[model samples]
Target: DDEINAQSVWSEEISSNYPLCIKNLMEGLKKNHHLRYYGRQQLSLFLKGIGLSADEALKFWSEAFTRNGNMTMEKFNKEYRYSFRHNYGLEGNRINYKPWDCHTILSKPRPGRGDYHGCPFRDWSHERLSAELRSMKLTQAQIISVLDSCQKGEYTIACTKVFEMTHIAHPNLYFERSRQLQK
Candidate 1:
């Protein structure tokens, strides 16, 4: 993530025509250089929280990204639910699904509730992170205002903002006993 910036692309072809969202991700990485890890570690923790042992974090990321040889928010929304439901033990609820929902796991034993297992793609999930918040009680919103001093795109800003919020990604969580463990 450090090697790449808004102006730089892994591939000069499609990256040459990178979309605003990609630019957002580049800029976010450049802005948040303080929190650096590896591909799985960085990307995973970027969605989940921090302060995890390398092995534990990798375990979560491996399942999410390696499941299809790519780590992307686009892939996360799907794999997360699937893994949580099948890989993890969902308690008849979605929010309490799994860490895969976040697409990565920065830390293994997250300190508090809603910190470990919240989906990183919750914001973009069509089902809503928390339906109960509306009806099913499954919706989670990033706290960028609390993280960064600037306003940016949703995923990019949200990812880094999560870092600022919990010093880790995917740390955002709701307060529910069943979901808390999952988070």
Candidate 2:
């Protein structure tokens, strides 16, 4: 019943109920859905997972993409709205899909040459990864260890090593870790 519609996870009373990853996805979507269309798909699924109903999801995305005035409702409706509804199971199969967990994510087919999905650790090349570690101010020894794991096909373990090296297991902790490391 529409009368029983739940409050948005974005709402204050319900906000804290969402887990960290859901919170992060919502924040990322709000921050920049236009970065990649594929990114928005994940965001849409996550919003639903975190309890944003279909209409509410449309409203959130509409304002997010249109606030800058780069997109109009007409264009958004034509290009983006369909997928949003389909994602929520409003049409076709009517299946309420779950967000991709880590194993499903890792086992997904390797992203195509131009595809942006999949684990960064598994997808990034050695040189590019070196640059990332260098940017994080990881010690050469530590960077080598992480890279060695990646070379050994231990991509997930290598990513975990990165979190340890950066001293952040979650996005919310990243700022604190960065601030402490800056000194």
Candidate 3:
């Protein structure tokens, strides 16, 4: 039971955030319990299908959606592969490769974290994510790094850093649904 309760740590941490972020999440989660559950797990499954982890999935959904206003899976893989030049950039590879069905991602994953066969963050990396900031001309804003750090689950505790970065939700709800589907 104690191990099971550990996931509640997310709920515990949510409140200590800045007022606005919490307010928005509370409002959003109130309307979408499916979001609350599918958020991380979905992405985790997707990431595992390829060769990544929740580490990238979390950051990708949070920042990518926040930036683009939503995580357009095809768009993200397309642009990111072109910019980052990851695996999908190669010939014979398709963007937003869905080896498994969405219905499968909704189910539990197989064995490995990267075996879900349905990944949205395919062929992207930190460098590409950073480049996105440069392209958007937000390099000086520092929100870019903060959001990336959030993806890695690192960085010092700073409410302003987290909230301002995540506030991309208001400007973009596409990835918001993507984030929701992760649950």
lDDT tens per residue, model 2, 1-183: 132123344564344333323344455545555425555655465455545677787777777666567688898888877877788787766575776554555566765654454556667788877886786688889989998898888776786677677651332233234334445
Tell me how far the alpha carbon of residue 17 in candidate 1 is from the true structure, in angstroms, after superposition: 38
TM-score of 1: 0.21
* Winning model by lDDT: 2
lDDT of 1 by residue, 72-181 (tens): 55555554434433322333543442232233432233323212122233323333322312332212443324223222324444444433333222322321221233
- lDDT by residue for model 3 over 36-130, one digit each (tens)? 32333343332334334333433433443334345455665654423322322334446664323333432434224322222222222456545
Return the number of clashes found in candidate 3: 13
Better-scoring candidate (lDDT), 1 or 2 = 2
- Note the Cα lDDT for every prediction shown: 0.32, 0.60, 0.35
- Candidate 2 backbone collisions, by pair: none
**Predicted structure with the largest TM-score when compared to the true one:** 2
| Model 3 ranges with Cα > 4 A deviation | 1-123, 141-144, 154-183
Which whole-number lDDT from 0 to 100 does residue 177 have in model 2?
42
Number of backbone clashes in candidate 2: 0
